[PDB]
Amino acid sequence: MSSTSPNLQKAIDLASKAAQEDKAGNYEEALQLYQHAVQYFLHVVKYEAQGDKAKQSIRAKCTEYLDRAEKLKEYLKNKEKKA
């Protein structure tokens, strides 16, 4: 078995904390964590070397985190429209 790059480890940690913060209802913190996770996942997949299977899993996680993140942006826009 093989090595997880430090940038890719950053991506997973951030995502992990995003998920935690998401479920806790701290949506503003969650959103930032998701966004930065995606930033690292994109960097890794583009400029670090990995197999097809690795790229395919990163693409998958990228999709999920941007989905949720965008949904949180829209939520926060409407929470803010209140005032």
Partner: peptide, 13 residues
Amino acid sequence: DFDDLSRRFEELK
């Protein structure tokens, strides 16, 4: 090809 994700990530700022 990761353009769509890159496009969506950039917009998300």
